[PDB]
Subunit: 505 residues, 4 copies
């Protein structure tokens, strides 16, 4: 007999695991428990803070929900109006020393004239071939050339996507992008070139809210707080070291054993294979691909420069900086960095030289969060990446050479993005059903490895829907039909369902 | 305060209502109750019998299940292997003196060559056009011609569908057919023509099962029997006459009042609006279109003729018979008609003449079930339709003039098919949201009026999913996404889910 | 027996007849003569002069030669370099207050933006449609729309062509336009729009030459002059009144009769039929359609205005003027109008008002030549047309209200354009063979009624080739295969052929 | 100064040279003469006879004319009705034991059902792709696949064409085939498949005439006979050995020199380059490609067998025989082989065995003429080719093993077909104009190397038109525009033109 027995054990307390927990807690039927090796829940949706008081999320995190259930839980956890800030998405792409509104492909109008001709010519060729196309594109690259043409492909899509995905567009599938990659309309785009008009509204994150305190991690801390504490085990005491799939037993680092009837595993599935000592699973998970994410944080002295303004996040396709994206993190909340009266010495100027004075001085302060991808196809020198990011901020004119840096942050996240490679699905349809036969629901950004349903809401609902399948025979819609859930408002499932209304009387 | 109060009230005990009831019974949470004006549950999935002992379903009823949950409930209701008979899905199209295997286009080698030429030319035109198509068809008619070409459309799908729907194909939408591209398989069709080959779309793995006893209606009696009797109210005592949606009160014919928190209504939505005395909904539901169904049954003396053979159901595009479909119902179960030793007098011969003798003779017997549609655009003379069907049987060479008819059956079903008109969705998306705002789940063949999710399995699951929506916040997939549920096997939901395992 | 007998009789001494005569003269085999009712050769390629000394051709006459033989004859006729002036082929379209360089579509950058948008959108439709087109257009109108799209077609080619042909574009065939595919050059059009530029289809290479003296008519006087005078009969003495086909006899005004073995007739075929008293051919030729041409000339005082500049001919699609084309005729040669020292009084101001003085003043002078079409489908008030044209010049900003007009000219030419109606070929394939069965070669702008080979060079060569068919069995390429002769370098036939080189030895 | 001096020298007296000569003789202006290294004119349109009395043309030669001028000359040369026989083309393709009516691709209906499926499927794929194609095929092979599909390509077009052309279809251009390779109509072909109908009327030689005596060579002997003998020089005395383009002098084998002003050369252009001692031209002509033709003749004892019947010529794509074509030469004229009363011993049986006796027996007789191609890509064993042909006749059931052969013929013609390679036009555009600038008209099947205009009537007219260009400035239409001359009735040029009629008066 194990030290503990539950009907449903949940491994991991990032958004996916917390979703499972919240639904299990709502249903209030089967016995359950949730573990995490980190004292603080949140996973990749956590927030660090530097010794100088600058917060950094794990790169640009912005909340946009496809589901009422997710909204209910966020609202329950942070109920007050002042718990949140609402923002309009101000996003641009850096091209030829100018800012082009996102998305690039919908704003050819803001490019130099020569590039406009190249881009429109390409789009015209794409339009004409699309008129007689009877096959579907097989790769990301093919999709790009078919929907946008060579000009936009060469000028932006190919270099940008390598820079973020850390693999070439030719290596990726194209079934994942319905809600990620705007397909430009030939008429609309040439119309906007003629009129000198912009088109900045595409996509589900054109408007967003952000938590007032604690960064994104504050959401997940607060959501986890609504759970019955005795059913949680966060910390070294919650680290899973072994999974015995055959005896339905999990063993924690400190030796505690947990018996389960059903397992919801949200750890990276490659890690799960290893913990299962299941060599067949290990070899299959090794066929999957992922990129690592470097997050670099820079804290800067001074009121917000006019050149920065209300910008939220910014894309960098070009080669004068190593990061693919920058977020003006100080625009998301005034509590993402120190108050103006906080005294901090300058650590260095942006040009890398030492400050004239070592004296602690006041603010105000603003804050830039940078992301740099890494993979076996795109190596990164970890020792120079911080300095390279800062010089890149100078190169791109985000920072003046004389700007004063009062805080820095660098952290590498090994599992950053699950790459939509050509091989992904062939591999997953071997992995998942083999786990499913053992009553293991492997779910989440790396639990199920599907980026198109890899945001916080998707993740949370992967957890919720796993529970709903386990208990109520629900369809795992988010897991198996990304375009379906992303294309509709999912209003049916609520934090209070009829089951609870009826049972209360 | 009403005589009875329940959390969820279910109106109607056809497949849809029985689905709601089965799921509620499984969940064993909220209180509930199911009513029907008929003593026998089953609705349009019920079965009649003539005084001569010949059963007739409400027209051809062949089960193809898209759902494990539905299978679970059928298996539970009729668990024994000898409760069912299995058959291949054998069907033909009657055309120009031939039984052409379905699908029609793969079998046109049976037609005269000159006709084959016109068919192939038309399908070539359609394939060339499909190659450069950049719009979807807007009408059923457009969809038909783009798939088949002119000549083939004119021979089968066009005239057949008018005889079925009782409205022209030019007046119907085509989204209900699903997302498949409307385009010919030119090579498959031309290949069979070149080879002089025929081929039906059936075989050892393309089968259906039919209940051994009581016809299709036997399934629903069995399913209903698994319910707690006290939570059902079937018959005159269960007829709903008034629905006060603001009080959430329903009034029965005998005067009994039922209070509910949520209503699952499976009656025809047009009757619901009348029962609600809601003038806006009456006006809206009166904008929907439907056809009535005449079911004609003919019992015949003799062993099964070779010309009939293993045929299951048959299509009639031509105008030498009024029915659009015939079913050799005697092929579905031996118990659909009397045993061979049963003695019955001949009522008439197939050509209408009187029999030589009035004496009762033995069988064996076989049985034909016919369907004729009726709408404002296609009237039916109820006084001659039986005789006209029987003449139709002679014209189509199903019966010889000498065949001895020993039983006849005719019944008209007012609400038979809900029509996928071009206007349907424009109307439904005003009716359904309004009923939803009043906590009324109107669901079913005429509850929600969507033919593409209008079979027994869809109907059942419409009731199941409505309850799952009410209780567990489930998505109503069958209701809103027919292509979704029809394109996959729905395995997740079971008669025994985790929740019931953990509870015990 | 007739008064005169020849092998080959040529009726008409316009370019077609002169071509026939030049080839007969070169061949110097069969006997021949050429007659004309006019003492001056040239036909519709003649030139008038006003009492004030302003020359006017019969509307804008610009030579583009497809044939070496035609070049040879023009050179022989006017051999000196100073017999010609050379000009670039400079033309514009008057549209919405702008002079848009030709071709119209490559220059829509001059139009307002919202209109550019509508033009480009329509041309995009046209390009997409052209990509899947498997049929040839059947009318002029369909051809226009397929080449240009709706918006651009509505701005220029549609209203302009109605004003030219005096019949709707929907009533004309399109084979006469050549074999080129009716499809947009979308990239060239959007590229000039994107670059905001203009560009006409002329330059140092795209030029025409124009006779230094006597207008276009000086060419044909000089060509005719190389003929043996005794073989010509020009004037009232040369007017044909009767053609007896069955007897092969022609009768002139003064009662003179000419017998022939072969007849080359260049008179309007409908007139030929009348002259033949052939009721059947009369009935057929009346089924042909033609427009009449009003030529209006305006002589103006002043040096050439800057706004006019080097413009040569100009197109007018809009209805603020009755003319479809204007020519800056004073730009073709300084001898098309009086020298600056010549003195003329002002007849009226461009706004119609009387001049302040009636005194004769000096120049310099410039000159405008306008064309107005007329047909049953489009009447012309011959009494107001001059004044309407002059108002048109003001409306189109060609003339200021103050401009001083010193000379006016108006002449109506009954057979002006042979119309390429949908019916034209069905009628001509009945007419020409019947004439051919009688050894009658009916050829020329109205001799054979085919606009696409209705220019000076085509006409001249129609006569040349008819003679060559008569004598040497040559194929009549120009007559029967317009696309062939217009698409190739016609260098084989020369004014001096082997036959003449060999004979003189 | 040279021994002889003429305005126009014609080298070669095959159809092309005789065409030149006939026209120079009709014009009767410039002096001229014609020379040939052979005493009997006719070139590749000549006829041999075996010692046993069996005639053989140089492979299947059948007369079909696009030109009245050609007709006039044949009719003048052989004016009597009994000089000619008229025949319906009866032509088949040997495929899988069956005779498939010509053209193969229009008679899929005669193939076995399984092959019908493969062929139609292929034609369906081709039709669908052709619906959206916007590029011309570049190679013969591409054209084949595009117009007929892969089933017919593999079954018939690819093996058959290598077998005639002696190069693979991938090496040839496709601009030459308008009148040679039928493009099948999907509806028509599948309709005949369904109805079991044949379609055997395609093409310009569906009906033909053949001279009653002397074989094809009889025509050119008779045509040459109409020329002034003193202007001809045929035999060793007329063999050109040297051409000096700069001096415009030709040297014959016997040392005779001839000065010309204009040269019409009809010898193979590669021979001309060598004779010119012009290394640059030799180098260019070596870039052309040609196949050699082996003609094999077999005379057979017996009345015409029923399996042969009225067959004219037959095609053999299969590798069970070396010949690409067989002609039933005895069907063309009763005078192509001996009378029935002639006694001839049996030389061999068709199975290869010697016959019993040397007894000379009577006929009647019939005759098969076979063609085998050869090139550097397709060697032929000359020592066995006769026996291989005869065994081929047995494999294809044309001859029974016991058939008695009474005469055999074999001759190799070095230049047989000028191959339409991809490179041909590029090379000819460097060759022909260079010769033209030296007053050399190189014309004919190997004079100008263009197969699409390589028939007897084409060749003749290339000579006629060259003279017409030289004397009268005519366009050389056949040479430069094969589809033009092949698609029209060429009726204008006659043996008696207006010129001769007028001068005779
Ligand atoms: O059934 C047939 C027979 C021949 N050809 C083609 O026709 C061409 C010309 O052959 P033809 O015998 O008419 O001319 P010849 O070889 O005598 O020059 C060949 O190269 C073949 O490719 C064809 O398309 N279908």
């Amino acid at each position: 007999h194990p030290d503990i027995s539950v009907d449903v054990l949940v491994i991991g307390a990032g958004p996916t695991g917390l979703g499972a927990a919240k639904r299990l807690n709502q249903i209030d039927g089967p016995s359950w428990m949730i573990v995490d090796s980190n004292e603080t829940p949140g996973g990749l949706a956590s927030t660090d803070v530097t010794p100088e008081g600058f917060l950094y999320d794990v790169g640009g995190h912005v909340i946009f929900s496809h589901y009422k259930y997710f909204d209910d839980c966020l609202d329950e956890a942070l109920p007050k109006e002042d718990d949140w800030y609402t923002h309009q998405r101000i996003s641009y792409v850096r091209c030829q020393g100018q800012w082009v509104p996102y998305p690039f492909q919908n704003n050819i109008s803001m490019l130099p004239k020569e590039e406009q001709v190249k881009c429109i010519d390409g789009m015209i060729d794409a339009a004409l071939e699309a008129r007689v196309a009877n096959t579907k594109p097989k790769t990301f690259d093919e999709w790009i050339v078919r929907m946008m043409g060579t000009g936009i492909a060469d000028l932006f899509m190919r270099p940008y996507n390598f820079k973020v995905w850390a693999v070439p567009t030719t290596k990726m599938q194209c079934a994942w992008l319905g809600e990620r990659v705007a397909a430009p309309n030939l008429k609309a785009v040439t119309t906007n070139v003629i009129l000198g008009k912009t088109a900045g509204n595409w996509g589900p994150n054109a408007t967003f809210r952000f938590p007032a305190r604690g960064g994104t991690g504050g959401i997940w801390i607060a959501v986890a707080n609504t759970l019955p504490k005795e059913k949680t085990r966060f910390g070294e005491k919650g680290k899973v070291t072994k999974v015995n799939a055959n005896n339905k037993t999990v063993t924690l680092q400190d030796g505690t054993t947990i018996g389960y009837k059903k397992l919801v595993s949200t750890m990276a599935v490659d890690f799960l294979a290893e913990a299962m000592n299941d060599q067949e699973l290990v070899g299959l998970t090794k066929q999957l691909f992922y990129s690592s994410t470097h997050v670099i944080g820079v804290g800067v002295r001074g009121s917000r420069p006019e050149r920065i303004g209300d910008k939220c996040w910014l894309y960098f396709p070009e080669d004068n900086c190593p990061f693919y994206r920058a977020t003006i993190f100080s625009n998301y909340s005034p509590y993402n960095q120190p108050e103006a009266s906080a005294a901090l010495p300058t650590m260095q100027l942006a040009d890398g030289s030492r400050p004239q004075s070592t004296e602690a001085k006041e603010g105000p302060y603003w804050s830039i969060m940078l992301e740099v991808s890494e993979s076996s196809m795109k190596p990164v020198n970890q020792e120079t990446i911080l300095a390279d990011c800062i010089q890149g901020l100078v190169n791109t004119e985000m920072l003046k050479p004389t700007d004063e840096i009062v805080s820095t942050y660098h952290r590498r996240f090994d599992h950053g993005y699950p790459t939509p490679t050509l091989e992904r699905e062939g591999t997953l349809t071997q992995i998942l059903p083999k786990l499913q036969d053992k009553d293991i629901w492997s779910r989440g950004r790396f639990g199920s490895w599907r980026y198109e349903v890899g945001n916080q809401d998707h993740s949370f609902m992967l957890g919720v829907e796993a529970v709903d399948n386990i208990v109520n025979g629900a369809v795992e819609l988010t897991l198996n039909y990304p375009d379906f859930v992303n294309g509709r408002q999912n209003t049916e499932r609520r934090l209070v369902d009829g089951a609870q209304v009826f049972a209360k009387s």
